[PDB]
From a paper:
The wobble cmo5U in certain tRNAs are further methylated by SAM-dependent CmoM to produce its methyl ester, mcmo5U. CmoM is a member of Class I SAM-dependent methyltransferases (MTases), which adopts a Rossmann-fold with a β-sheet architecture of 3–2–1–4–5–7–6, where the 7th β-strand lies antiparallel to other β-strands. In Gram-negative bacteria, CmoB converts ho5U to cmo5U employing a unique metabolite carboxy-SAM (cxSAM) as the carboxymethyl donor, which is assembled from prephenate and SAM by CmoA. The tRNA-modifying activity and the specificity of E. coli CmoM was first reported by Suzuki and his colleagues, who identified that mcmo5U34 was present in tRNAAla1, tRNASer1, tRNAPro3 and tRNAThr4, whereas cmo5U34 was in tRNALeu3 and tRNAVal1 (17).
Here, we report an X-ray crystal structure of E. coli CmoM complexed with sinefungin, an analog of SAM, and cellularly expressed E. coli tRNASer1 containing cmo5U at the wobble position. The asymmetric unit of the X-ray crystal structure contains a tRNA molecule bound to a protomer of CmoM, mainly through the anticodon loop on the protein surface enriched with positive charges. The N-terminal helix (α1) swings towards the bound tRNA by approximately 30 Å to establish contact with phosphate groups of C32 and U33. Another notable change is observed in the organization of the loop encompassing residues 170–188, which is mostly disordered in the tRNA-free structure. In the tRNA-bound state, this loop mainly interacts with the phosphates of G30, U31, A36, and i6A37 through the formation of salt bridges. Meanwhile, the hypomodified base of cmo5U34, which has flipped out from the canonical stacking position, exhibits the most extensive interactions with the enzyme. A total of five residues are involved in multiple ionic/polar interactions with the modified uracil base, where the 5-carboxymethoxy group is thoroughly examined by R26, W124 and Y247. Therefore, these three residues appear to be primarily responsible for the proper positioning of the nucleophilic carboxyl group on cmo5U34, which is approximately 3 Å away from the Nϵ of sinefungin. The exocyclic amine group at C2 of guanine is one of the key structural features compared to adenine, which is specifically recognized by the amido sidechain of N164 and the backbone carbonyl group of A162. Surprisingly, the structural data was consistent with i6A at position 37 instead of the expected ms2i6A.
Residue numbers in the entry: 1 to 257
Write the structure that this text describes.
Amino acid sequence: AQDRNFDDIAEKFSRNIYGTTKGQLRQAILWQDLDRVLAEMGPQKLRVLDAGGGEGQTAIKMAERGHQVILCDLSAQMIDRAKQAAEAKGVSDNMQFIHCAAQDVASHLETPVDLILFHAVLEWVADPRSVLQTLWSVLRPGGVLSLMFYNAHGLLMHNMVAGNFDYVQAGMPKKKKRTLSPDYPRDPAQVYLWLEEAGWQIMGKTGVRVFHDYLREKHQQRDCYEALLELETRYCRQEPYITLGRYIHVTARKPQS
RNA sequence: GGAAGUGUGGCCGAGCGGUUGAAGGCACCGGUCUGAAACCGGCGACCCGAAAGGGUUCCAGAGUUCGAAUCUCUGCGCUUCCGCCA
Ligand SMILES: Nc1ncnc2c1ncn2[C@@H]1O[C@H](C[C@@H](N)CC[C@H](N)C(=O)O)[C@@H](O)[C@H]1O
Ligand SMILES: [Mg+2]
Ligand SMILES: [Mg+2]
Ligand SMILES: [Mg+2]
Ligand SMILES: [Mg+2]
Ligand SMILES: [Mg+2]
Ligand SMILES: [Mg+2]
Ligand SMILES: [Mg+2]
């Protein structure tokens, strides 16, 4: 079992996610957390690894804020897209692009990094425990891991809301190739264990899209976006709403001695 | 054993001498698609060939024909009737 290279769903992903409120809300919530992290990490500029950075929307926004950003990805097609978008934003000088697995990234870094982005990758890698161990090894003491993983509860809940009862009865097996539903939706409690057992200390948990995907009237996703975002922002950091997010964003600290 | 009748593709089902190795359907495989029907393409075996691809086979084979899934014959399997057995 290999990790999912996004080559043959690059366009679909960019269109269905970043071309809709799904991507817009993802980025909005995520950057609420990230800007808190950046400020709490002092005002110096940072070294940021975006492991599995894809088309680079998050990595470029980090670069616009002045940091040195290294993006690596399995997919040649995603790397090329990220290269173009970065040029067209004028941030290519602050950015490095590496066509390698996150597992193999350590040999491409001259020095450790301050902050790691691992966003919507964990649910696509066959051996999550192992990748997290590698990412730990390239993070300086006191560094932060920004981990956004796809939540199995959100897929159960939305399939229920949508009325796909037969599919849920059958355990929701992933048989559709080239869907954007991930190969390995994660149990959040298990992911929290993975981080704590491997020494990380969890500083925050945020639900990402905790109401949006379940709306009875999908058109309100766009027509009512500003009000929806305000209420997503209000509730997405308390239970049960954390555990209802389609994604969950965990902020975790590498300890210092 | 003897007639008649019968045998189409994985399963169904069109095919009363040619554009039918085979319509159409289900299944199976692949493709398209948010969030799990539809649409698109394919889809037996054996033989030949390095490959491209060619051949045979519509129970099996032989024949008639320019041409056979389609006509004739022989065999094989089945069905009914008879006869066998009692
Ligand atoms: N082991 C891996 N190492 C590096 N990149 C990976 C790996 N597995 C998957 N990917 C890439 O991870 C990306 C996952 C996508 N969900 C996009 C993530 C991107 N960070 C985003 O938030 O949009 C794809 O571009 C994949 O090609
Ligand atoms: Mg039949
Ligand atoms: Mg055929
Ligand atoms: Mg057919
Ligand atoms: Mg078809
Ligand atoms: Mg024949
Ligand atoms: Mg013919
Ligand atoms: Mg003949």
